[PDB]
Structure 1
Amino acid sequence: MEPHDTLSPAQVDEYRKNGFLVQEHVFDEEEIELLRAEAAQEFASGGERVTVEQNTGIVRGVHGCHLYSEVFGRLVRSPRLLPIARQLLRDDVYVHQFKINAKRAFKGEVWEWHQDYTFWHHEDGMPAPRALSAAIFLDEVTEFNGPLTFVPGGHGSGMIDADVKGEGWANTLTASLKYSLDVETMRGLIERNGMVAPKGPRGSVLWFDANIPHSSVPNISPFDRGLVLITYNSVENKTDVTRGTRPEWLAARDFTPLTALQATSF
């Protein structure tokens, strides 16, 4: 393997200030094709772990793949990913959540403004927002294929009071989100901080804070927007399983600290 990757001090500062950071071209075309093929397999065989877009039935997401797929199990331990998660969370880490979110060409939904941590705190018993997500770009992310859109520095407020809607956890994965940020709060945020939709080539990784507000629009391009999202959590920040409400394929219960893939002959 290559000497474990880490972010420069400038990159770390940028991540801390803005709440997100893109590394371009982390994975090459052949690597991304391997991940795309495995994603397709998970969409086909994932069963109850799969979600479909309402009004289309097109497969939208699949969850918990690193528990069921050897490829994705290895991916979360990649020397391209694990060392940076450790660096940013300043701890050993484990995977809280794994999901693949596809927005096909000419498809896609408006994803309501939200903070991930609100879900993890209330649904899963995550005590603090000492977690982040790595979004691997299976496709080039552009202005026009429904990029994750953020309020830069919007995580600095911490967790924001949100409109709650629905019972259970069914609507934690849907177009209509259980925890959504209202018109008023978002106006103030954006007036103060603005909006940014990070772009990048296929194989890029977008790191973003558990508490950063984000949203996305439909894909009006003729090109898909597949993302593999790995949520790393600090081991010290392990969720309180006694307040947990969701299956392990949404919220992990094995808090064993991850170690990196080492090079083998097979």
Structure 2
Amino acid sequence: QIMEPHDTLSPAQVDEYRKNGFLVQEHVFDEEEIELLRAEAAQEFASGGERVTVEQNTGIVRGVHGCHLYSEVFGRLVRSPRLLPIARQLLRDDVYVHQFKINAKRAFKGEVWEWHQDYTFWHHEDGMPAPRALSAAIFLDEVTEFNGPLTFVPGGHGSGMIDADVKGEGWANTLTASLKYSLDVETMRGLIERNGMVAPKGPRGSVLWFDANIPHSSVPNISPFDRGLVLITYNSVENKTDVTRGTRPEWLAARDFTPLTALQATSF
């Protein structure tokens, strides 16, 4: 009977997150915790059925989606006192999970993620009315320069949504190497020319926080080292999506907007 008092971000941390559109906290989770998250990720890849995506070239696991609805471990993770208080502080509201994914980015054969803003998809596919949302990516493996790290244009969220060409009809291609919305090179080259690019690194158990509208990308992982990320997308409850205008299953775009509460210490 005692969890550690909720920790929130410093005012400088908050500033950095607002100016850059991302922020890394190192070693939020320890090794044993990361090993539990890894074992549960594996179970979900094995048993997720239609919720699992596979790589085009190899048929190797690319993603598993909506796990917090199906796994007791992931349903508790999203309420962790290491995460929830910060989601609530950054979004200045009570929050809920809009989306939960584990992106495997396997060694050697892990494929690209093209440049995009997340809000673009959540707005047009799910009816998210404003970009008042964020993601927390938990590193199940050390992130280096060589294993296809998640990459951002810092400050690139200052513009809001950005002209992306749509491509195709339903939603299967929202999770693929070739993405339904994506930035056109010209659009990108200029962002990059103006703002640069940054790929934050960190050890296992770090959490990378980022804005719903920051442009980001990742190159193929041809290295020998996996780069497993657990991505939790937190949305402001006031900003709940309009389910009238929603097109995807629950396991991609949540419908239950109950405010999350933090996990308390129990004897089990």
Q: TM-score, normalization: structure 1?
A: 0.99
| In 2: Cα distance, 1:181 partner to 1:255 partner | 30
Separation of aligned partners in 2, 1:124 and 1:64: 14
Matching of residues 99-248 of structure 1 within 5 Å: 99-248=101-250
Deviates more, 1:215-224 or 1:53-62: 215-224
Identity %: 100
1:176-227 CA-partner distances (Å, limit 9, x unpaired): 0000001111111111110000100000000000000011001132110000
Q: Which deviates further from its counterpart, 218-227 or 240-249?
A: 218-227
CA distance in 1, matches of 2:68, 2:213: 23
Instruction: Name structure 1 gaps, 5 residues minimum.
Output: none
Deviations 1:40-61 (A, max 9, x none): 0000000000000001000110
Query: In structure 2, how many angstroms separate the alpha carbons of the residues matched to 1:169 and 1:124?
Result: 11
Count of equivalent residues: 266
Q: What is the SS of the residue equivalent to 1:71?
A: helix
Q: Please name the residue that 2:37 is paired with.
A: 35
What is the alpha-carbon distance in structure 2 between the residues aligned to residue 5 and residue 231 of structure 1?
A: 19
Q: Do structure 1's residue 65 and structure 2's residue 74 form an aligned pair?
A: no
SS in 2 for 1:156: coil
Give, in whole Å, the separation in 2 of the partners of 1:225 and 1:117: 23
The 4+ residue runs of structure 1 with deviation greater than 2 A are none
CA distance in 2, matches of 1:111, 1:74: 28
Offset, 1:110 = 2.1
- 1:108 Cα deviation from its structure 2 partner: 1.5
- Give the superposition deviation at 1:169: 0.4
Aligned equivalents of 2:55, 2:111: Cα separation in 1? 8
TM-align CA RMSD: 0.6
TM-aligned CA deviation for residue 89 of structure 1: 0.2
Instruction: Compute the TM-score of the two structures, normalised by the length of structure 2.
Output: 0.98
